[PDB]
Each structure stands twice: as C-alpha cells, then as structure tokens.
Coordinates of C-alpha atoms in Angstrom, one line a residue:
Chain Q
X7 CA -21.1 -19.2 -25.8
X8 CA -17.7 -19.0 -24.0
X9 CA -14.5 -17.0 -25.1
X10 CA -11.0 -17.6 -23.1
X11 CA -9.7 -15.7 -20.5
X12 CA -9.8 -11.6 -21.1
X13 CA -13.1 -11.9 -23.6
X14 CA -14.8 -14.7 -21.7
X15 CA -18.6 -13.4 -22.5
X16 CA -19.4 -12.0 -19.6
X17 CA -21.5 -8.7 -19.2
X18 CA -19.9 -5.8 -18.4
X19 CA -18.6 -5.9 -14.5
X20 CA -18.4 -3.4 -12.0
X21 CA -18.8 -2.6 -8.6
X22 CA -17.9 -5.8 -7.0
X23 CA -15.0 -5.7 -4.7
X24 CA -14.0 -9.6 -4.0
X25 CA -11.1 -10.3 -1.3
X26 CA -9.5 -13.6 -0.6
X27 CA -7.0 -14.6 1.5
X28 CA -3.1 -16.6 0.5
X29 CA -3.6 -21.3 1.2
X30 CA -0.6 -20.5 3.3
X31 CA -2.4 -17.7 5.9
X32 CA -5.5 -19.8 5.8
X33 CA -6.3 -22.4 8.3
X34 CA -8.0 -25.0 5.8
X35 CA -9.9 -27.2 8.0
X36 CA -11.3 -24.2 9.8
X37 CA -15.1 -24.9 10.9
X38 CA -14.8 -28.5 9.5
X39 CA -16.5 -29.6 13.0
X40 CA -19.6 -27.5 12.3
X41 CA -19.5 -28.1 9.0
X42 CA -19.1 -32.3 9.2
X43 CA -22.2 -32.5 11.2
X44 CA -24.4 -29.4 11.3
X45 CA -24.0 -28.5 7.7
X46 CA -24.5 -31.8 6.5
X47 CA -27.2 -32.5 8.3
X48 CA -28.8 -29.4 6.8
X49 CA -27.9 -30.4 3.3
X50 CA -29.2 -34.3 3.8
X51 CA -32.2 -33.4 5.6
X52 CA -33.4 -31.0 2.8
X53 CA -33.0 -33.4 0.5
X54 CA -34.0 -36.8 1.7
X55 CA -37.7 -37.3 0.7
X56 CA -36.4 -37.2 -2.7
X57 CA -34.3 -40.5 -2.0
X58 CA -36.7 -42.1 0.5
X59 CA -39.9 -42.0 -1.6
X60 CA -38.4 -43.8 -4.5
X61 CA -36.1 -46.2 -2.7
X62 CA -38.5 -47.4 -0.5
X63 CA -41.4 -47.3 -2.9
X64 CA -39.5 -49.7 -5.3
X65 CA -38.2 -51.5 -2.8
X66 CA -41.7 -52.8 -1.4
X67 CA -42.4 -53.6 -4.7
X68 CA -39.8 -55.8 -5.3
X69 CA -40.3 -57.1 -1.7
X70 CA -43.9 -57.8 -2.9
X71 CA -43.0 -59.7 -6.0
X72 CA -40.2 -61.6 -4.9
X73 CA -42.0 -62.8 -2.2
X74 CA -44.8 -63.9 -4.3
X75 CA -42.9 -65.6 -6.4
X76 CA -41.5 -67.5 -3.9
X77 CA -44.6 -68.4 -2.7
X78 CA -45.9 -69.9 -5.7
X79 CA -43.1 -71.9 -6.3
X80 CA -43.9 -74.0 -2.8
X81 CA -46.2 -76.9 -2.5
X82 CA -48.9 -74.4 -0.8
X83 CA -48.7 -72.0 -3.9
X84 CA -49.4 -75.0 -6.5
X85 CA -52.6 -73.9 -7.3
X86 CA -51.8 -70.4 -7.7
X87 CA -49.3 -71.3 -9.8
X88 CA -51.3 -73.4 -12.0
X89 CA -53.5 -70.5 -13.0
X90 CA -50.8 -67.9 -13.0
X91 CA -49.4 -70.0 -15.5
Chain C
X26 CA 31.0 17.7 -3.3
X27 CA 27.2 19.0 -1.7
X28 CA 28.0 21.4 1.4
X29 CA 27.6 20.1 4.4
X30 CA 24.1 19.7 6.4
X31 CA 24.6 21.4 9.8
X32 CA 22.4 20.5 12.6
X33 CA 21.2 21.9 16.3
X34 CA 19.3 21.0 19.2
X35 CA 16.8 23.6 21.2
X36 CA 16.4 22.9 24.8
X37 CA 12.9 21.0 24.4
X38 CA 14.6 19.0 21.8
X39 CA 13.6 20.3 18.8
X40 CA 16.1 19.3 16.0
X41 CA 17.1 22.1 13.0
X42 CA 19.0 21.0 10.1
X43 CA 19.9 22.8 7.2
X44 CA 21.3 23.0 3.7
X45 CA 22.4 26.3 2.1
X46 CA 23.1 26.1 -1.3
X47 CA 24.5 29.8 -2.2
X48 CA 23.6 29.5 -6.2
X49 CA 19.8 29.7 -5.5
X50 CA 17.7 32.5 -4.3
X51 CA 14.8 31.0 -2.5
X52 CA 14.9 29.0 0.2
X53 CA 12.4 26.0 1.6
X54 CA 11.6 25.9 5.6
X55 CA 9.2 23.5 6.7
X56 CA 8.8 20.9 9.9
X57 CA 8.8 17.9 8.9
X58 CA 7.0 15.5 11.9
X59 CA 7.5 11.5 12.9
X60 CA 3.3 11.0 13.4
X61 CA 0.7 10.5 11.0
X62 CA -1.9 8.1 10.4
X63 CA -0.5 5.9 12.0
X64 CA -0.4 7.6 15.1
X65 CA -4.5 7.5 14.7
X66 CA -7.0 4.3 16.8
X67 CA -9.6 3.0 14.5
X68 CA -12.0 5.9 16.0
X69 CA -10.4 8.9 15.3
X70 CA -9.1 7.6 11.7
X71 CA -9.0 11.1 9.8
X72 CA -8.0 13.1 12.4
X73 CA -4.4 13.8 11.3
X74 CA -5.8 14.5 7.7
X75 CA -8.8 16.5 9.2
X76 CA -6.1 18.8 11.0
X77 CA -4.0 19.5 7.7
X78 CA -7.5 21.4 5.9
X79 CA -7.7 23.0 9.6
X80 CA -4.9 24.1 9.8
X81 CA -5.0 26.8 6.6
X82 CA -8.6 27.7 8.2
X83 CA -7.0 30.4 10.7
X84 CA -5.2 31.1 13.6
X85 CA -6.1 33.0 17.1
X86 CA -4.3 35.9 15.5
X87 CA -4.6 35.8 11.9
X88 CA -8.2 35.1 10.3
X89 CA -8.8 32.4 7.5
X90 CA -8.8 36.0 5.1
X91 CA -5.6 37.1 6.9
X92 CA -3.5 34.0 6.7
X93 CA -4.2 34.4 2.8
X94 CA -3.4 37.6 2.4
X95 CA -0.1 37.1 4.7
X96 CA 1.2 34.4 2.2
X97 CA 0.1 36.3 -0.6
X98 CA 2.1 39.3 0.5
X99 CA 5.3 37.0 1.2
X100 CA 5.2 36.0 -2.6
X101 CA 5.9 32.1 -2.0
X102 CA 3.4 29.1 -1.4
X103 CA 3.0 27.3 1.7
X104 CA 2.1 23.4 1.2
X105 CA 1.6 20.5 3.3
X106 CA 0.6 16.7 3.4
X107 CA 0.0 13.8 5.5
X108 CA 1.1 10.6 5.3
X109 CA 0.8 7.5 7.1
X110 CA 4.0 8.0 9.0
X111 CA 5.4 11.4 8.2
X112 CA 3.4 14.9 7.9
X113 CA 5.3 17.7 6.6
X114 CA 4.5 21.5 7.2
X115 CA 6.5 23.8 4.3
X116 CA 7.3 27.1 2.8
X117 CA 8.9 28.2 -0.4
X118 CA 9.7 32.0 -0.2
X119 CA 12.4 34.2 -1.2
X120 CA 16.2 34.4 0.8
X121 CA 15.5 37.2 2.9
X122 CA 11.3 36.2 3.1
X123 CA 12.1 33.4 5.6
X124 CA 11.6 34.9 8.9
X125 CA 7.9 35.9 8.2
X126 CA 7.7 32.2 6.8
X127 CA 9.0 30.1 10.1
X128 CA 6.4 33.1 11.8
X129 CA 3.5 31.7 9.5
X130 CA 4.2 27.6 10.1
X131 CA 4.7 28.5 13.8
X132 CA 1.5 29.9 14.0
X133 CA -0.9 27.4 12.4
X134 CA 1.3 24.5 14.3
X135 CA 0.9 25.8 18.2
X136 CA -2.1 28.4 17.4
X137 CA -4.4 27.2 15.4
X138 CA -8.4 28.1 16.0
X139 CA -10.1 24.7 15.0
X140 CA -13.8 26.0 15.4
X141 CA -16.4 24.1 15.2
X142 CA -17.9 26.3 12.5
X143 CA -14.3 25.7 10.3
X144 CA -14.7 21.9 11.5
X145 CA -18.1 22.0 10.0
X146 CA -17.4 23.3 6.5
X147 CA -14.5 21.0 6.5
X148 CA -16.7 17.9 7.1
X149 CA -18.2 18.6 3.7
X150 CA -14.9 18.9 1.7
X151 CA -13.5 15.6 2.8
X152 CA -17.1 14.0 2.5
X153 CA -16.5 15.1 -1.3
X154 CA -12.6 13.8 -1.1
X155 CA -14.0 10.5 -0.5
X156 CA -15.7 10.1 -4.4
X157 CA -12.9 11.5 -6.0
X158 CA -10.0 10.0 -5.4
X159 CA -11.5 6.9 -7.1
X160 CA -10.3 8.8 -10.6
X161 CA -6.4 8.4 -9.0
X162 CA -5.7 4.9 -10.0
X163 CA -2.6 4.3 -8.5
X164 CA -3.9 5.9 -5.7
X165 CA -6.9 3.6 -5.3
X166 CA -4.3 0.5 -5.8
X167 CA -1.9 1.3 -3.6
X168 CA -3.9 2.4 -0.7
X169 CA -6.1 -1.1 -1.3
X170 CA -2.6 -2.8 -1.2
X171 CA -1.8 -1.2 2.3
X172 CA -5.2 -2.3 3.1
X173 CA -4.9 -5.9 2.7
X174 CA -1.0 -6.3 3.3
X175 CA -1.5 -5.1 6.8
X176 CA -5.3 -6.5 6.9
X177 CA -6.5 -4.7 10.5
X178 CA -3.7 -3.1 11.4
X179 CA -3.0 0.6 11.5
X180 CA -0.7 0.6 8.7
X181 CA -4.0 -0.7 6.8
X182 CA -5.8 2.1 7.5
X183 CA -6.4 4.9 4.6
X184 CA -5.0 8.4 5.7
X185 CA -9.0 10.3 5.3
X186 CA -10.6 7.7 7.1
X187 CA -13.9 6.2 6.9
X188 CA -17.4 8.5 6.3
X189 CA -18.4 7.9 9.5
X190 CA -15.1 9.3 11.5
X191 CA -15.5 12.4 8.9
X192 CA -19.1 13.0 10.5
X193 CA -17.7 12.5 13.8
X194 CA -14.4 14.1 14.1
X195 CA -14.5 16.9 17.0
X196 CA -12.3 19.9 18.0
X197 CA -11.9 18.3 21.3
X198 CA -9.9 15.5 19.5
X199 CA -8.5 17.3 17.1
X200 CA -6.5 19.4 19.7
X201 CA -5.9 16.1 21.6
X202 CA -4.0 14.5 18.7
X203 CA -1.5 17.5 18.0
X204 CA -0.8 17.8 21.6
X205 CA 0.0 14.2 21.8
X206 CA 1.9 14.0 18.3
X207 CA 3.3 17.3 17.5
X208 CA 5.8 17.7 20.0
X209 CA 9.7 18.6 19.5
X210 CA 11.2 15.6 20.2
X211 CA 8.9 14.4 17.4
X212 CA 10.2 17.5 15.2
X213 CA 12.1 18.8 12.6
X214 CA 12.9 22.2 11.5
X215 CA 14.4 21.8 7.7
X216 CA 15.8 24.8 5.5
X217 CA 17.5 24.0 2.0
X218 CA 18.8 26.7 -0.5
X219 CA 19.6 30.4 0.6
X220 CA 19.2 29.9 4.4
X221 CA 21.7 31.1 7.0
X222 CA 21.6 28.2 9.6
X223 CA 22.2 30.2 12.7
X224 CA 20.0 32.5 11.5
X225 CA 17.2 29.3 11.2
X226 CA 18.4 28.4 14.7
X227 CA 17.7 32.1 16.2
X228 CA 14.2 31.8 14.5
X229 CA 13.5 28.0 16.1
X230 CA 14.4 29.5 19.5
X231 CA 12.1 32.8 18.7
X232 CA 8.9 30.6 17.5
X233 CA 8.9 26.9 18.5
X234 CA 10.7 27.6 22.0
X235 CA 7.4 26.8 24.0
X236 CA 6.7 23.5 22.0
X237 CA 5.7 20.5 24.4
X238 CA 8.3 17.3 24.7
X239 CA 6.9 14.4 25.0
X240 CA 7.0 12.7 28.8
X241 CA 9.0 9.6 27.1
X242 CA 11.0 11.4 24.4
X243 CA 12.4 8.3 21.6
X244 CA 15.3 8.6 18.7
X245 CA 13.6 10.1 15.5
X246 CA 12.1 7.5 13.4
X247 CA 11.4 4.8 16.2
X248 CA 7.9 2.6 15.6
X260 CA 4.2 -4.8 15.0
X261 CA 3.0 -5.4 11.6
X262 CA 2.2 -9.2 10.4
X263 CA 1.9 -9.4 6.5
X264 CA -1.0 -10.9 4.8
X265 CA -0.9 -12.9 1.7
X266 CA -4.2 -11.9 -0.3
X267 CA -5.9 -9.8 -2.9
X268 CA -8.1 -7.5 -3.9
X269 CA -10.2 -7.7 -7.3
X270 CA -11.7 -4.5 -8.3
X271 CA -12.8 -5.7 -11.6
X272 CA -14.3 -3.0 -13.7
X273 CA -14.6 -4.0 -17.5
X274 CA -15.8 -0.3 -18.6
X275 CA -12.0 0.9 -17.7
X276 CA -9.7 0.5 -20.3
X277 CA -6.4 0.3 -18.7
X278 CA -5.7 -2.6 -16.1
X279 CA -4.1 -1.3 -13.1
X280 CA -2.2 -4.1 -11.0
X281 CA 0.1 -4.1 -7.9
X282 CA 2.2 -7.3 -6.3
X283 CA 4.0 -6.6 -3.2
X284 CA 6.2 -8.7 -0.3
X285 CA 6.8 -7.5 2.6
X286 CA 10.0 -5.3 2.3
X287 CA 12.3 -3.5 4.4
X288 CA 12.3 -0.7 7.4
X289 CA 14.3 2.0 6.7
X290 CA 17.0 0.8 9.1
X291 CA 16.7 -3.0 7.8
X292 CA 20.2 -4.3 6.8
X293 CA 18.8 -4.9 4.0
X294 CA 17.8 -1.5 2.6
X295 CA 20.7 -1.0 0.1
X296 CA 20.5 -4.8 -1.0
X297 CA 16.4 -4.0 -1.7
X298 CA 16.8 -1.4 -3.4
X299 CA 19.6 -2.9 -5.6
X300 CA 17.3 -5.6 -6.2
X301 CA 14.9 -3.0 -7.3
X302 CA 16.7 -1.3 -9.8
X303 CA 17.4 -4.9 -11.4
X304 CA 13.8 -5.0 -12.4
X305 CA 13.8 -1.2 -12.8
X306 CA 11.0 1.1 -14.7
X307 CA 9.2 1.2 -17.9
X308 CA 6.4 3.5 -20.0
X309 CA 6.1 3.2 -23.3
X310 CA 5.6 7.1 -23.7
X311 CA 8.9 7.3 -22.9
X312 CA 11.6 7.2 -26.2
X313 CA 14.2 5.4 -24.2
X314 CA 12.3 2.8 -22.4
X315 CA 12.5 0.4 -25.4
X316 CA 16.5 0.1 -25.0
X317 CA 17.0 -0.2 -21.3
X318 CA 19.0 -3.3 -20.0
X319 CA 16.8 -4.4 -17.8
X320 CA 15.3 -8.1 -18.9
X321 CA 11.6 -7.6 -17.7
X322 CA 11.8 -4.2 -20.0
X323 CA 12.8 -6.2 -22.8
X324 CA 10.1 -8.5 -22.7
X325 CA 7.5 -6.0 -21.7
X326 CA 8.5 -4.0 -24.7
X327 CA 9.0 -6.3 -27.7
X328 CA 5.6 -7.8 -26.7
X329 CA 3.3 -4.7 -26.2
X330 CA 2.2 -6.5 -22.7
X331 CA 1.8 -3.2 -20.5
X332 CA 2.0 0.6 -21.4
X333 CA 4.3 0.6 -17.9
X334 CA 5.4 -0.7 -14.6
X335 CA 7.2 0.8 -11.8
X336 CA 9.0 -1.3 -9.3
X337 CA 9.1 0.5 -5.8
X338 CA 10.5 -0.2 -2.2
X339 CA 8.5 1.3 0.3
X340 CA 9.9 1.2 3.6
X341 CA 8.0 2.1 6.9
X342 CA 9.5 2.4 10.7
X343 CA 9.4 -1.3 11.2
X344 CA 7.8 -2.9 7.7
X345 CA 8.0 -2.1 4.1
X346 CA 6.4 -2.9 1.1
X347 CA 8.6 -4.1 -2.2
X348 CA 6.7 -5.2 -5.4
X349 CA 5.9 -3.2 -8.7
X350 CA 2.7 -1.9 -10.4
X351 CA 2.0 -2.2 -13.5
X352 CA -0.5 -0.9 -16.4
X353 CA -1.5 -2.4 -19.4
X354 CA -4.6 -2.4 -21.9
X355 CA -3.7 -5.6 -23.2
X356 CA -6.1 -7.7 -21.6
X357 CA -5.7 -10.9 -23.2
X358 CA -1.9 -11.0 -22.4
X359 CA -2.4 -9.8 -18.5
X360 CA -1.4 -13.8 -17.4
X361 CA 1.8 -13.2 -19.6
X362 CA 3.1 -9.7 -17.8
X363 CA 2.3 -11.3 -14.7
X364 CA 3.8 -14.6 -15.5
X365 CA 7.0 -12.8 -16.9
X366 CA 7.2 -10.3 -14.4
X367 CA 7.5 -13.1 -11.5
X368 CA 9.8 -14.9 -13.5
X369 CA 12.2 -12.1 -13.6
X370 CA 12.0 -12.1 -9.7
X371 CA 12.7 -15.9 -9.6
X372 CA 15.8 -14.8 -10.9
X373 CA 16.9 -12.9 -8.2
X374 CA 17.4 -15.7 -6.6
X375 CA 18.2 -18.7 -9.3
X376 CA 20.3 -16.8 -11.4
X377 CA 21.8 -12.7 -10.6
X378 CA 25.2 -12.5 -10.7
X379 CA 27.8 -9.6 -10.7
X380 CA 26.5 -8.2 -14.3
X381 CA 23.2 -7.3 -13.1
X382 CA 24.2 -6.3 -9.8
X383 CA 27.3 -4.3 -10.9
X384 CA 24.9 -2.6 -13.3
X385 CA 22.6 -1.5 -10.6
X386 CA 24.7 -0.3 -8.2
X387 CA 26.3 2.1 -11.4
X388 CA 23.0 3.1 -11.8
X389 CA 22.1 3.9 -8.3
X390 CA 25.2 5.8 -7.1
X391 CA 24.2 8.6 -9.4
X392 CA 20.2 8.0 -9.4
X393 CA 20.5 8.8 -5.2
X394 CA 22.2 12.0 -5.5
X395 CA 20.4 13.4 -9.2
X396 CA 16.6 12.7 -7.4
X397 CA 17.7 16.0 -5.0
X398 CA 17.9 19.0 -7.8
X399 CA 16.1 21.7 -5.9
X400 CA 15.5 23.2 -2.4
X401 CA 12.4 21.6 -2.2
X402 CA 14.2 18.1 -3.0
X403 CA 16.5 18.7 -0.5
X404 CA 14.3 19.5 2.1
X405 CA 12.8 16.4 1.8
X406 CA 15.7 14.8 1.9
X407 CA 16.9 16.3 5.2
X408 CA 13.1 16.1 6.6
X409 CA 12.8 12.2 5.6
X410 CA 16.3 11.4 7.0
X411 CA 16.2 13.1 9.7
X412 CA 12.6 11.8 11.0
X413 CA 13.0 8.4 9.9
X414 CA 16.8 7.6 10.5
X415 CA 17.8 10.0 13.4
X416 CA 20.7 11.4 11.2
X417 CA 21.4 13.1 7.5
X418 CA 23.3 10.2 5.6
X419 CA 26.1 12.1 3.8
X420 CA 26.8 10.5 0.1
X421 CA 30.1 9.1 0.4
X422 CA 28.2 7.0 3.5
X423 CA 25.8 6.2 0.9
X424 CA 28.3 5.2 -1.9
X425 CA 30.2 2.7 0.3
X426 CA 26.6 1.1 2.0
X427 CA 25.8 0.4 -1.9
X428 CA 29.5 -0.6 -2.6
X429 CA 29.1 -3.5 0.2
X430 CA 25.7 -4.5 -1.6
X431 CA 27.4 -8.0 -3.8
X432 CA 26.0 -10.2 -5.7
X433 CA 25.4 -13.2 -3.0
X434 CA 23.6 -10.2 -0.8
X435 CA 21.0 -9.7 -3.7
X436 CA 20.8 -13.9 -4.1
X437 CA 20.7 -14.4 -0.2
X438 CA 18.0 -11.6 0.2
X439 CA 15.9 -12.3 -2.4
X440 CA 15.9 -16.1 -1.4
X441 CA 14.3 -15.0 2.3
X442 CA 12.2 -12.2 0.7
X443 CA 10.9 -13.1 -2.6
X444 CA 11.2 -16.6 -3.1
X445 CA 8.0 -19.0 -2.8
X446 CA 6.4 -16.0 -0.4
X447 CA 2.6 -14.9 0.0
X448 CA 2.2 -11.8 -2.1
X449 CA -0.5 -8.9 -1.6
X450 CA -2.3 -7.9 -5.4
X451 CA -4.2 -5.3 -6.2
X452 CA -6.1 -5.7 -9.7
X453 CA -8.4 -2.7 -10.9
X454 CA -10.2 -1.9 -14.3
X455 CA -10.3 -5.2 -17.2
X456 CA -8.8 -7.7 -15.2
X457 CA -10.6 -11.0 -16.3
X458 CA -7.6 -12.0 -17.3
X459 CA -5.5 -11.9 -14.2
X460 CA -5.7 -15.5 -13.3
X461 CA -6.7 -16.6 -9.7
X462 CA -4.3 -16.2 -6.0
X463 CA -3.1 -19.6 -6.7
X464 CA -1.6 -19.3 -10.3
X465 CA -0.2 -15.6 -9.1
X466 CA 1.3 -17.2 -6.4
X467 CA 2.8 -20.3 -7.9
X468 CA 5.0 -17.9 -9.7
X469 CA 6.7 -17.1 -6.8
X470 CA 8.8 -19.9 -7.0
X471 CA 10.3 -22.4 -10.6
X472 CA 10.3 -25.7 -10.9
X473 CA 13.1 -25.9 -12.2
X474 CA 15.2 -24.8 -9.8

C-alpha cells in the first residue's frame, strides 16, 4: 500500500498547478501574531469539551472518594467505618 | 573574413544596417523593434501580440485579399513574431524583389486598418491560441519559469495575455501602443544577403521617412526585476515524458559577465539521445546522463534580457524513477563550476565557442537576426574578431569567481511538467546548490 518515490500509488494526477515559494524569499514567522492567539484560540476552543468533560468528571470523582475516605478515617467517621468495613 | 556590416542614420533616427553577402540570391529586409511585451501594463497584456495577427489583416490601401495577393505575386514570405522584448517585422524575397518588400512592411507598420470587424475575428483566433499551446511543452515550461522567476513583474507576464485582456483589447489601444512603441529611435531597418546598402538607405528615406521619434529618444537596447526563488509543479502522470527547467538569475546582455556565462554554459553543454554523437561528447553531465539512460535530453541556455537574464538548463526524461538522480547530478555538475573548473574545461569551451558564434549565422535570415538582435539590444553590430578576444579574456578564475556569485548556494526557479512524482520537494532541489564538502 505504498511504493517509493516515481510509483508511490497514487491515482493518476492532473490538473493541479501547486506553487511554492524558496525558505530564503520567505518571511517564516509571517502572521505568527495572528496565528499565536487567534488561531489557537480557534483550534482550543473547538476542541475543549472533549478535555473538560472527562477531566473534570473524574476529577470530582476522585475529589468525592478521597474525601470520603478521609472522613472515615477521623474519630467522627468511626461508625461509618465500622460498617464499611 | 564576413564583409563588413555598414550602418546609417535617417533624420528621425531611424538606424539601417546591412549585410550583403554576393554568393546568395535573395535577400532578408525586416525591422527589427526594441518593445514588446514588456512594453505592455497588466491591462493591456496582449496588445503587442494582438497587433502582430492585425497587422496581416490589411492596410488603408491594400485589403486583407490584396496584401495576399501582393506577397504572393513577390514570390517570398513575409513573417513576424513578438517577443517579450524584441518584435521583428521581415521579408524573404528575391535580389531585385526588395523594393516592393520594404513598400509592403512599411505599409502594415505606419498604415495599418485595425477595424473593429478584423479586431473581432481576431479575438476568436487567440481565444483558440490560449488551449493549444499547452501541446508545446517547452513552451508551457519556460513561459511558467518567466512567470514565477519574475513573480508580478512584467517580465512575468506571458506574451498573449490573459482571456480576459483578449475579450477586451480595443482599436483605440491598439493604435495607442504602436504609436508609443514603434517609433525610429526604437527601430531597425536590417538587410542580409543580396542587398545594395545605399540602395536600402534610399528605400528607408522613401518609406519610413515620416516615422514618429520618441519625445525622450534612449541608446538601442536600454531597459528593475527582483528574482524569485520558487516552483511550479504541473504534475500530470498521463504524460510520459517529464519536462523540467532550473534557472538563476543570469546576465543582461551588456553584463560583464556575458562571455564568462556563456562559457560556463557550454561547460555543461547539450544532450539528446536521438542524436549519434551525443554519447561521446566531453562534457561530464553528458556522460553521466548517457551511460545511465536518466533523460532523453537537456539543453543548458543563457537567456539574457535588457537588465536580467535567465541561466539554467531543461531537461526531458521518461525515466521517472531516476528524476532525483538527473537532478541531483545535474546540480552537482554546477557545484563544480565553482569547487573544481580549471583551464581544461574552460580551454575546451572557449574552442568550442569561437567557432559555435560564427557557424549559428549560415543564411540571410540568420544574419538578419544577428544584425537586428545586436543592433536593438547592444546599440552596435559586434564584429568577430571583437568577439574572439571578449571570449579569449574569459579564464578560468572568471568562470570560478562567477559561478561562485551566480550559482553557488542561490534560490533557483523550477518548472516540473508531465510524471514528476519523483522530483523531490524545493528544499532537496535547492540543497544541491551548494556541497558539503567543500
């Protein structure tokens, strides 16, 4: 499912004209301004319920648990403990 | 010893020069011009190549029908093209046919009828010139390779011009570029081969007397263009032969370095495997190219323009897995115009050159060129022995030094058409520009 360079197993190509430009012409950084904070901002925002929901659902979780354990482990939570065990 | 090329001077300032070669029996007059495309805004691209079809569409004398018949009846051909610097107006005839010839160019020069009916008809024909020239290969690579090299500037610009100027081009600015451009100061009256030059000169003075000079009349061949490195892919795997240019910028025709460029070219030199020769020339990039079956040919050219040039080579090969190696080789062979040339190849180059400048002019039409060229672009005809000692001064620390500013670790323009998969990235082009070794 991949040849080498000349027979690489692509269909037939034709029509497309692509242009590029020599590193030396080329400013490299140009539009790194825009691109630091408005283009990352659209990348990050389309993508961060996919982070949040998880993080912070597993996160309470273990906010929950630790805490309870905690809890049981004091003189108030003796009782709890007892039956828990 | 070539006899001498006289030239004169009319009062407006249009220049005559002539050849006469007394072996032959017909004789080429033609004007060659300093404008072309170039001359053209990014509006009326087309123009000076919209003119050219106009101006064997008839006259305010002779009709389209008439102007045939008129050539016909001379028993010669008339011809004429545009380029992006030079347009040339010409007529091959018979010794004692030349009068009614210079009467013919005069005529569809100063008197041409450009109506808008002609102007219509024409607008068709170039529409179709647009989907054909895509069969001329070399054609469709260099003029991408102008293109990009001069990316936005006038030299970019193709000599038919874009579809929409076609639809748009009007009498009105038509006449306004010839007045502008064709004027004598910007012209050049040329006979080679059975011409009498003060018969030429009476026949200037009879027909192109009431030419226009322009209000700020320049030398012949005077002009700013910024090179850029980049490429054009054109990738179409149903050809079967790749088609590839690499170019630097090169040398004006009055650089300093014109005789050391084209020295440098004749190192690399030509190749086609058609040819029965090509498998025993000296040149090292033909040895390689040959014993390894990498291309079917390359040509190395010089192009030089009033204030730019373009120096590279183009190359054609249907070996498309071993593209990276003829590219790869090819640049190393430049390398070594500046690591490693030394007297042998440069002595060898200069043999060949002496004679291949003087053999490239063997007939009148040759000639004519030669005169017209020189004359528009350098001001003067360059007599031989001129010639032989500008090459003689070319040495071997010239080609080094030259090649070291010009070639060496420099942004290239490439043009790849047809199966070119195989042509790696700008990067891996342009990293052999320069060798690590050295």
């Amino acid at each position: 499912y991949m040849g080498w360079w000349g027979h690489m197993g692509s269909p037939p190509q034709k029509g497309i004209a692509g242009y590029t430009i020599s590193p030396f012409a080329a400013r490299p950084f140009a539009g790194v301004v825009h691109a630091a904070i408005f283009n990352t901002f659209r990348r990050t925002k389309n993508q961060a319920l996919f982070v949040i929901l998880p993080v912070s659902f597993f996160y309470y979780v273990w906010t929950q648990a630790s805490e309870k354990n905690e809890w049981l482990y004091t003189k108030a939570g003796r009782h709890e403990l007892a039956k828990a065990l | 010893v070539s006899p001498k090329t006289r030239t004169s001077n009319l009062k407006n300032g249009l220049t005559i020069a002539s050849e006469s070669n007394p072996l032959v029996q017909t004789a080429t007059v033609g004007v060659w011009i300093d404008a072309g495309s170039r001359n053209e805004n990014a509006y009326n691209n087309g123009t000076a190549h919209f003119f050219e079809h106009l101006a064997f569409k008839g006259t305010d004398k002779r009709s389209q029908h008439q102007l045939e018949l008129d050539i016909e009846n001379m028993g010669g051909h008339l011809n004429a093209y545009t380029s992006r610097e030079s347009t040339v107006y010409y007529a091959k005839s018979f010794k004692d046919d030349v009068p009614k010839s210079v009467e013919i160019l005069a005529d569809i020069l100063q008197h041409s009828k450009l109506a808008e009916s002609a102007i219509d008809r024409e607008r068709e024909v170039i529409t179709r010139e647009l989907e054909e020239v895509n069969k001329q290969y070399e054609e469709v690579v260099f003029d991408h390779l102008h293109a990009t090299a001069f990316m936005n500037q006038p030299l970019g610009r193709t000599i038919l011009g874009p579809r929409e100027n076609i639809q748009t081009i009007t009498n009105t600015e038509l006449r306004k570029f010839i007045t502008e451009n064709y004027t004598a100061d910007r012209m050049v009256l040329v006979g080679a081969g059975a011409v009498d030059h003060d018969a030429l000169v009476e026949l200037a003075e009879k027909y192109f007397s009431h030419l226009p000079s322009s209000q700020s009349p320049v030398p012949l061949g005077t002009p700013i263009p910024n090179f850029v490195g980049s490429e054009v892919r054109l990738r179409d795997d149903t050809m079967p032969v790749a088609h590839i240019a690499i170019a630097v910028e090169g040398v004006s025709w009055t650089s300093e370095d014109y005789y050391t460029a084209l020295v440098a070219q004749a190192i690399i030199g030509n190749y086609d495997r058609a040819v029965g020769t090509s498998r025993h020339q000296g040149s090292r990039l033909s040895n390689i190219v040959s014993e390894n079956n990498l291309a079917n040919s390359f040509q190395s050219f010089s192009t030089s323009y009033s204030d730019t040039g373009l120096w590279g080579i183009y190359l054609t090969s249907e070996n498309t897995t071993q593209i990276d190696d003829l590219v790869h080789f090819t640049l190393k062979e430049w390398n070594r115009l500046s690591t490693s040339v030394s007297n042998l190849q440069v002595e060898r180059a200069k043999s060949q050159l002496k004679a291949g400048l003087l053999l490239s002019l063997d007939g009148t039409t040759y000639v004519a060129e030669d005169i017209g060229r020189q004359l528009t672009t350098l001001g003067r005809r360059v007599t031989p022995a001129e010639v032989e000692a500008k090459l003689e001064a070319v040495t071997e620390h010239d080609v080094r030094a030259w090649a070291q500013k010009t070639l060496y670790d420099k942004d290239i323009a490439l043009v790849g058409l047809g199966p070119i998969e195989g042509l790696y990235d700008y990067n891996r082009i342009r990293n052999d520009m320069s060798m690590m070794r050295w």
